[PDB]
Each structure stands twice: as C-alpha cells, then as structure tokens.
Design a protein around this nucleic acid. Structure first.
Length: 48
DNA sequence: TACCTTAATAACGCCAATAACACAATGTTTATACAGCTAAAT
C-alpha cells in the first residue's frame, strides 16, 4: 500500500537476524546479547 | 551494534518455626566417709 522498495524492509530483518545469530553462537560459553552489545560499545570507545 | 521495557529470572532481604544449644533443678549417680559393724588381733 505504501510506495517503497521491499529491499530495506527485508534488509532490517536480515541484519537483526545475523547479529542475533552471531551473539547467540558467537562463543562456546553463552553470553547475554545485552552484555555483549555494551562490551562492543566499550571496545569502540576504547579504539576511538 | 540502540534502547528498554516490562517483564521476567534470579539473586537477595525478611520472617515464622524450630531443633538444638543451655541452664535449671532437682532426683538420681557418684563418691564419700566413718562408722558401727566386721575381719583379724590379741
């Protein structure tokens, strides 16, 4: 009904799924996704 | 590579009850004696 390309709607869902999969199976020991995101933000701040 | 929200999970606090400590107190146990009894003595 809205006039827009479907690629962006598909892209957001694909990106969310990939990030979630990486966090869930990223390490042999399961680590919380919220804990992982804060660690990623801290690492980016340290790099800057 | 955001947030959070709320909710929920899980920790935690608090509170009963309580078994166990604890002492008490006696009545027992124990030891005691000292004692009239007894063995030996004489």
């Amino acid at each position: 009904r809205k006039g827009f390309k479907f690629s962006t709607y598909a892209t957001w869902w694909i990106r969310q799924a990939i990030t979630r999969s990486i966090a869930d199976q990223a390490r042999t020991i399961r680590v919380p996704v919220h804990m992982i995101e804060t660690i990623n933000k801290v690492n980016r701040i340290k790099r800057q």
